[PDB]
Each structure stands twice: as C-alpha cells, then as structure tokens.
C-alpha cells in the first residue's frame, strides 16, 4: 500500500545521474572517524561490484516545523512527519550528523560549500528541510515513499546537487536544483527477530566453538576459515555481516531463501565457493552472484520448488536469536558447509583446529544458532577495518618509491593522504581518551570496563607489528 515512513526509520539518500549514457541510481555514503567528505558508490550496478550498504545508512530522530526549530535553537538549555518540515539525518555507524562545511574545492570558486559530517548537534547547518519537488502533491500533506525529494539546510538555504566538473560524482551544495530520490531500508525494530543488514556471531555446538578466520600475520593469507573454540568467542574476529543484493527494503525479516552476501567486517571481503580450492574468501574484485549468494532453510531437505515470499513488507515472524538451529546451503551448488574433521593431527594441536570444507554427505550436526552482536563491538570492528585499510594504503604509498633519492619534482606517482591520516589519528586520540575522576564510582568502573574491552578487542586484531 502506502509506506507509513515513521520519524524513527532508517533512510538512505539516493539520486539518478546520467554521465555514462545509463540511468543508474547512486546513493550517498560517508565513512566514520576519517575524511569528512561524502563519496558515492555504485549501488544499482551490484551485479559486477559489491555495494557497501554499511556506511550509507542514516537515522531520523526529530521532525519539527521551521519556527519550532528556530525557537529550540534560540533557547537550548514514533510520530509521523509532514511535507516541508525539518528532518534530522544521524549516521548509524558512530552517531554523526550530516552538516555543511565552510570550505571550497573542485576548482570552481564562487560558491562551493562542501558538505560533510559533524560531531555535535548544536544546530546551525545541521538540520535539513523538505520542499515540493513534484507538482502532483504540495506542502502540508503526507510524505510518500519515493517520488523524489529536495533536501535543504536550515541556516544555509542550499540544495544538494552533483558536480559537472572534472571531479567524478562529487556532492556539493549550491543554488541549482537537483532531484533526490527516496529509498527507505529498515523500519521499527522487533522484539528479537532476525533483521537484514545486522552483524551476527555464528556459533557451533552449544558453548564450545564458533566460526571465524585465523589471525593476521599467519603463514599465509586469511582465506582458511577454521573452526576455533572459545578463545575467540567474545572476540571481534568472529563477526559476519549479511546483506541482500536487492535495492528494496533490506531491513525486513531475513526470510528463508533470500540471497545472502556474507561480508567480513574486518578484511572487507566476502565468503563464497570458487570451485577451485574449497571454502575460500573472495575479495571485492570477483563479485559474481552465482557463487557468492546463500540462503536459509529448515532441516536437511531441499523443498525449494517455485520461489515464494517476495513481499515488500516486514514479513512473517521467524527464528529468534538463539531460539533454535539454522541450516545454510548454497543457492546454486546446494551443498552443506559443515565441518569434516577427518583425523586430529598432532601438528596443529590447537584444541579445536578443524578446516571448513563443504560436501554433500554432511555430518548431521549443523548446529548453528543466531546470536545478537553488540553495537559497540560492531562499531569497533568497523573502526579497526577502516583504520587498518588506511595504514595499509599509507605503507603501500610509502613503499611505492624506496630507491629514488633524486627529487627533481616531488610528484612522481600516486599521492598520499596526509591530511586524512592526520585527522584520523586525531580522532583516534580523541576516542581513546581515558575518563577523568569526577563522576560516580559505578560510572567510572563501567567506563574503565568499556575501555578495557575496546583495548582487548583492539589487541586481538593486533595492528601492532
């Protein structure tokens, strides 16, 4: 029917651009404690590249009128929304705010006003309002799903447009009009039901072993996928993110038979079967939906037949977190990925050291139950992944030239992100700041416990060598 669109639902901004003679759709994404500059990623053309639907989601908090917002700003110290009201946009990764910076770029001068992210919510160029885009409807009416929208800041009455200069798909803020499509993803949270786009901790047995990858700086690459016991049960290495490929409401219930893309939250890779070495981890280059897709089913029967349950709504209730077991099988290959354990070797005497290999026979022991992952743990894991990627890029750029002490022009190849890495270390310093001694003892103990947990989850991933 008509989407309710509550003021507490996940919203992903998107727009359509034609620069390659194609009417594809591009969304807006921004990283966390890094370069505060919005960047675009291919989300409509997901068949060849994997779209990252993790740093592009935003959350609505408040919806007030212009005069009410002005009154609130003048004196600082699930309802619906109307058409032509102030709308907040809070980042769902680490609780940022969509703001406009007073900078200039793109070699355009005049009026650039580059957009970015803000740490606080003091106001000014932080809120955004809606305006009539299509003549079908006017102000004062219910906001409909899709059908394009216009986002304008309150303090700076500027639109959101693209870049027509040499810069490839740069979001700027000027006075030209550019339609922006609306594509909601998630809805109000349930009482413990499986939701797409949420990280999960896969478990094996009851409380003995889990599924993860070996630690870094090993004898080879991290494409082994072993079966470690309780050592990494509470560690960030055993974390998986699932996202369907569809552009539709990914926040609905993760019903059986839906295409699943298992994405590593630490290496930024995907798990699939290449039919060449077994259960290996594939990068973002070879992104084929034939082998990278997975599905859920009940028991160990096929019962696939004709496709079913292609509805747009939330969907029927399903398995809760830790209620019962689940079975994972390939969508095309149709094999079970349960462990084998042929013979316990005396070389790798790591208590539970079993390789994960898929076979048709199985072992009647696909005991996997879903477990909820904490928001802090997922945010920390995303921070480690992005930070390690930045340092890998930095060391690669430094090692690109090692034996050319000639000068004669500092430009010699790829550039380096000096400002971005400086801001990243400054943000990391501001994040790992131990609290001072002026609050209650229980709050201090909780803060130290959280800091110790962050440091331990940091050290398990390492990034010290």
Partner 1 sequence: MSFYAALIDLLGRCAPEMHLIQAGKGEALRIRAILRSLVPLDDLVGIIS
Partner 2 sequence: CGGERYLDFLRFAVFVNGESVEENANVVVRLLIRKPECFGPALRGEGGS
Partner 3 sequence: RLQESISDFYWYYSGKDVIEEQGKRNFSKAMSVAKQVFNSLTEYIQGP
Residues that bind partner 3 (CB under 8 A): 65, 67-68, 71, 74-75, 140
Smallest distance, partner 3 to C-beta of residue 318, A: 41
Distances (CA, A) of 30 to 16, 276, 398, 420, 428: 18, 36, 26, 14, 17
Radius of gyration of the chain (CA): 24
Is residue 67 close enough to count as binding partner 1 by CB under 8 A? no
Smallest distance, partner 1 to C-beta of residue 154, A: 10
Smallest distance, partner 2 to C-beta of residue 29, A: 28
Contact 98, 128 (CB under 8 A): yes
Burial class (CB in 10 A: 0-12, 13-18, 19+), 230: middle
- In the list partner 1, partner 3, partner 2, none, the entry touching 422 (Cβ below 5 to 8 angstroms by class) is none
Nearer to partner 3 (CB atom), residue 74 or residue 285: 74
Contact 15, 25 (CB under 8 A): yes
Smallest distance, partner 2 to C-beta of residue 166, A: 12
Nearer to partner 1 (CB atom), residue 109 or residue 399: 109
Site string for partner 1, 111-130 (x = CB under 8 A): x-------------------
Is residue 176 close enough to count as binding partner 2 by CB under 8 A? yes
Nearer to partner 1 (CB atom), residue 109 or residue 191: 109
Could you say which of 21, 67, 110, 406 contacts partner 2 (CB under 8 A)?
110
- In the list partner 3, partner 2, partner 1, none, the entry touching 365 (Cβ below 5 to 8 angstroms by class) is none
Which residue, among 19, 37, 60, 59, has the nearest Cα to 173 in the 3D structure?
37
- Beta strands 209-210; 203-204: pairing state: antiparallel
Nearer to partner 1 (CB atom), residue 24 or residue 111: 111
Could you say which of 18, 23, 109, 305 contacts partner 1 (CB under 8 A)?
109
Smallest distance, partner 3 to C-beta of residue 136, A: 18
Is residue 155 close enough to count as binding partner 1 by CB under 8 A? yes
Smallest distance, partner 2 to C-beta of residue 175, A: 5
- In the list partner 1, partner 3, partner 2, none, the entry touching 140 (Cβ below 5 to 8 angstroms by class) is partner 3
Is residue 164 close enough to count as binding partner 2 by CB under 8 A? no
Which residue, among 244, 274, 241, has the nearest Cα to 259 in the 3D structure?
244
Could you give the count of Cα atoms lying within 13 Å of 349 in the half-sphere of its Cβ?
2
Contact 193, 257 (CB under 8 A): no
Q: What are phi and psi of 2, to 5 degrees?
A: -115, 130
Burial class (CB in 10 A: 0-12, 13-18, 19+), 402: exposed
- In the list partner 2, partner 1, partner 3, none, the entry touching 176 (Cβ below 5 to 8 angstroms by class) is partner 2
Query: How distant is the alpha carbon of residue 103 from its chain centre?
Result: 27
Interruptions in the chain after residues (C–N over 2.5 Å): 77
CB-based contacts of 17: which residues, under 8 Å, 6+ apart? 24, 26, 162, 169
Smallest distance, partner 2 to C-beta of residue 129, A: 15
Could you say which of 157, 310, 312, 443 contacts partner 2 (CB under 8 A)?
157
Is residue 399 close enough to count as binding partner 1 by CB under 8 A? no
Smallest distance, partner 2 to C-beta of residue 66, A: 15
Q: For helices 441-461 and 375-400, what crossing angle results, to 10°?
A: 40
Which residue, among 280, 254, 278, 257, has the nearest Cα to 269 in the 3D structure?
280
State whether residue 392 is helix, strand or coil: helix
- What is the total count of residues that contact partner 2 (CB under 8 A)? 5
Is residue 175 close enough to count as binding partner 2 by CB under 8 A? yes
- In the list partner 1, partner 3, partner 2, none, the entry touching 71 (Cβ below 5 to 8 angstroms by class) is partner 3
Contact 206, 367 (CB under 8 A): yes
- In the list partner 1, partner 2, partner 3, none, the entry touching 155 (Cβ below 5 to 8 angstroms by class) is partner 1
Distances (CA, A) of 6 to 10, 57, 140, 319, 453: 9, 16, 16, 26, 35
> Applying CB under 8 A, which residues contact partner 1?
109-111, 155-156
> Applying CB under 8 A, which residues contact partner 2?
109-110, 157, 175-176
């Amino acid at each position: 029917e008509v989407q309710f669109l509550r003021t507490d639902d996940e919203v992903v901004l998107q727009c359509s651009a034609t620069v390659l003679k194609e009417q594809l759709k591009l969304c807006l994404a921004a990283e966390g404690f890094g370069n505060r500059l919005c960047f675009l990623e291919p989300t409509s053309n997901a068949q060849n590249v994997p779209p990252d639907l993790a740093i592009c989601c935003f959350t609505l908090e408040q919806s007030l009128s212009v005069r009410a917002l002005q009154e609130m700003l003048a004196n600082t110290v699930h309802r619906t929304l109307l058409y032509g009201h102030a709308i907040l946009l809070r980042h769902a990764h680490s609780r940022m705010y969509l703001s406009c910076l007073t900078t200039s770029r793109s070699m355009t001068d005049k009026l650039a006003f580059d957009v970015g992210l803000q740490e606080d919510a003091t106001g000014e160029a932080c809120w955004w309002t809606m305006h009539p885009a299509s003549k079908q409807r006017s102000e004062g009416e219910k906001v409909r799903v899709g059908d394009d929208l216009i986002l304008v800041s309150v303090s700076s009455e500027r639109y959101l447009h693209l870049s027509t200069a040499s810069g490839e798909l740069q979001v700027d803020a000027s006075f030209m009009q550019t339609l922006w499509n609306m594509n909601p993803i998630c809805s109000c949270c349930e009482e413990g039901y499986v939701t797409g786009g949420h990280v999960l901790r896969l478990f094996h047995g009851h409380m003995d072993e889990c599924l993860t990858i070996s630690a870094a700086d090993s004898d080879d690459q991290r494409r082994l996928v072993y079966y470690e016991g309780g050592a990494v049960c509470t560690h960030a290495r055993s974390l998986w993110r699932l996202e369907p490929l569809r552009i539709s409401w990914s926040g609905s219930h993760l019903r059986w038979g839906q295409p699943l893309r298992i994405r590593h939250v630490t290496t930024g890779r995907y798990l699939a079967l290449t039919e060449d070495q077994g259960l290996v981890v594939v990068d973002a280059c070879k992104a084929h939906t034939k082998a990278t897709s997975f599905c859920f089913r009940v028991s160990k029967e096929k019962l696939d037949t004709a496709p079913k349950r292609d509805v747009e709504g939330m969907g029927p209730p399903e398995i809760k977190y830790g209620e019962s077991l689940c079975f994972v099988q390939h969508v095309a290959s149709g094999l079970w990925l349960t462990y084998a354990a042929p013979d316990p070797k005396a070389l790798r005497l790591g208590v539970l050291k079993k390789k994960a290999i898929l076979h048709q026979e199985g072992h009647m022991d696909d005991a996997l139950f879903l477990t909820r992952c904490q928001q802090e743990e997922s945010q920390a894991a995303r921070m480690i992944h992005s930070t390690a990627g930045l340092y890998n890029q930095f060391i690669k750029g430094l090692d690109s030239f090692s034996g050319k002490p000639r000068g004669s022009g500092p430009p010699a190849g790829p550039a380096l992100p000096i400002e971005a890495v400086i801001l990243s270390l400054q943000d990391l310093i501001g994040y790992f700041e131990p609290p001072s001694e002026e609050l209650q003892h229980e709050e201090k103990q909780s803060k130290l416990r959280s800091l110790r947990n962050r440091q331990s989850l940091f050290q398990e991933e390492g990034m010290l060598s």
